[PDB]
Amino acid sequence: ANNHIRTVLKLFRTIDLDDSKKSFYLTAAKYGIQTQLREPIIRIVGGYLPSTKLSEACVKNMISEVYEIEGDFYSKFSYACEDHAPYSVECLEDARDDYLTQLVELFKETKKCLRE
Ligand SMILES: [Br-]
Ligand SMILES: [Br-]
């Protein structure tokens, strides 16, 4: 219900990816989080009855893993980019598929623990 939506949106708003990173990188990283995690989780918890207990521990662990997954994306976009110059669109594109794959796997695991 809308109480669960509020709780989940507030937790997603705590995600700080470092807004001084390249604008086009942040656009991609945030869009992946939005489309692979925030929107599908909001769809799920919006359907709960208002009295249903949502596992905040489950959502908070999901948030923690987003930082790890985005940090990996950023390293491969920048200094650890192998085949192209750091910050190049090739580096972003070359790392983006795996970033999204990791977010999809995190979504699948998070779904299992959402209900307390
Ligand atoms: Br949403
Ligand atoms: Br329910």
Author numbering: 1 to 116
Manuscript excerpt for this entry:
To combat these defenses, Anopheles mosquitoes produce inhibitors belonging to the SG7 protein family that block complement at the alternative C3 convertase, C3bBb. Crystal structures of albicin and SG7.AF reveal a novel four-helix bundle arrangement that is stabilized by an N-terminal hydrogen bonding network. In this study, we describe the structures of albicin and its orthologs SG7.AF (from An. freeborni) and anophensin (from An. stephensi), characterize the binding and mechanism of AP inhibition by these inhibitors, and determine a role for properdin in modulating the inhibitory activity of SG7.AF. SG7 family members are quite similar to one another structurally, but amino acid sequence divergence suggests that specific side chain interactions are key determinants for the observed differences in target affinity.
Previously, we isolated albicin, a member of the salivary SG7 protein family from females of the malaria mosquito An. albimanus, which inhibits activation of the AP in human serum as measured by lysis of rabbit erythrocytes, blocks the cleavage of C3 and factor B in serum, and binds specifically to the C3bBb complex. The structure of albicin consists of a bundle of four α helices stabilized by two disulfide bonds. Helix α1 extends from the N-terminus to Thr 14 and is followed by a section of random coil that extends to Lys 22. The loop connecting helices α3 and α4 extends from Ser 78 to Ser 88, with α4 extending from Val 89 to the C-terminus. The two disulfide bonds link α3 and α4 with Cys 58 forming a disulfide with Cys 113 and Cys 81 linking with Cys 91. The N-terminal amino group of albicin participates in numerous intramolecular electrostatic interactions that appear to be important in stabilizing the overall structure, including three hydrogen bonds with residues forming the turn linking α2 and α3. The carbonyl groups of Val 45, Gly 46, and Tyr 48 form hydrogen bonds with the N-terminal amino group as does ND1 of the imidazole group of His 4 in α1. These interactions may be important for the positioning of the helical elements and stabilization of the helical bundle. The SCIN family structure consists of a bundle of three antiparallel α helices with a long dimension of ∼41 Å and an orthogonal short dimension of ∼14 Å, while the four-helix bundle of albicin has dimensions of 50 and 21 Å. We assessed the oligomeric state of the albicin-inhibited complex observed in SPR experiments using gel filtration chromatography after coincubation of C3b, factor B, and factor D in the presence and absence of albicin and nickel ion, which is known to enhance the binding of C3b with factor B. Albicin markedly reduced the retention volume for complex elution, indicating an increased molecular mass for the inhibited complex beyond that attributable to addition of the inhibitor alone.
